[PDB]
Amino acid sequence: DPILLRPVDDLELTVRSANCLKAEAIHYIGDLVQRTEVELLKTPNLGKKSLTEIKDVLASRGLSLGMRLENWPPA
DNA sequence: CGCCGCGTCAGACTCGTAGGATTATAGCATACGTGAGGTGGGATGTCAAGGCCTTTTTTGCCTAAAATGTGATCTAGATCACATTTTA
């Protein structure tokens, strides 16, 4: 999709969550959605609420978590 | 009074078309200011690490306390080929 290929700062993320993302080598939103929730919760600084509001904003702009890709990355 | 001469003053309306100018003019010296150039220097703006507080993420922990396991003893369901037997 045209929205697979965006950096996450178009979502206007937060500093703690941003540190969580850059800390975990998660580059593309296609790389985001291929990651699973429990693969996030165990990670540093990602407990209750990061998952809450990131779930909110992805509920806003029409996508969800944990989805599955194929032919990734086209780069 | 009544010419005559001279002078003043208007001459329809909307569109289109082209580019366009020219002569010759003394010369050098003095001395002064202003434009374009340097130039250190306050001062502002940036970028990378640290101390105040609350919130957040782990994470102790606290005791109610319901749940998860132990296994031998049963139980009330469940079958199948033969013998009719009923109903549309």
Distance A60 CA to B72 C1' (A): 60
* Length reported for chain A: 75
Helix, strand, coil in percent for chain A, rounding step 5: 45, 0, 55
Distance A23 CA to B47 C1' (A): 22
Q: What b/e readout covers A14-39, taking b as 16+ CB neighbours within 10 angstroms?
A: eeebeebbeeeebebbbbbbbbeeee
Resolution (A): 3.9
For residue A45, give both structure tokens: 């600084």
Within A 8-67, residues with CB less than 7 Å from strand B: 16, 41, 43-50
HSE-up (13 A, CA, CB side) for residue A40: 25
For residue A6, give both structure tokens: 């965006």
Q: Where are the domains of chain A?
A: 1-75
